[PDB]
């Protein structure tokens, strides 16, 4: 998210705004995203390292 704007700069900003249909990417399921996009169930498990 941008400050004061909330407009996403990246893949999901292409996904939210009707531009892109499906986003198949290493996209982290975090709470900020899932409250305004949908995710399917995860396909890979990882963490901070």
């Amino acid at each position: 998210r941008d400050a004061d704007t909330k407009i996403w700069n990246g893949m999901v900003g292409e996904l939210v705004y009707g531009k892109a249909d499906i986003a198949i990417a290493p996209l982290t399921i975090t709470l900020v995203r899932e409250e305004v996009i949908d995710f399917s169930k995860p396909f890979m498990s990882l963490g901070i390292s």
Binding site: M11, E14, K19, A20, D21, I22, A23, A25
Partner: peptide, 10 residues
């Protein structure tokens, strides 16, 4: 078709 967006990462 559908739009299948990605990011360029190996």
């Amino acid at each position: 078709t559908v739009v299948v967006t990605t990011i360029l990462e190996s």
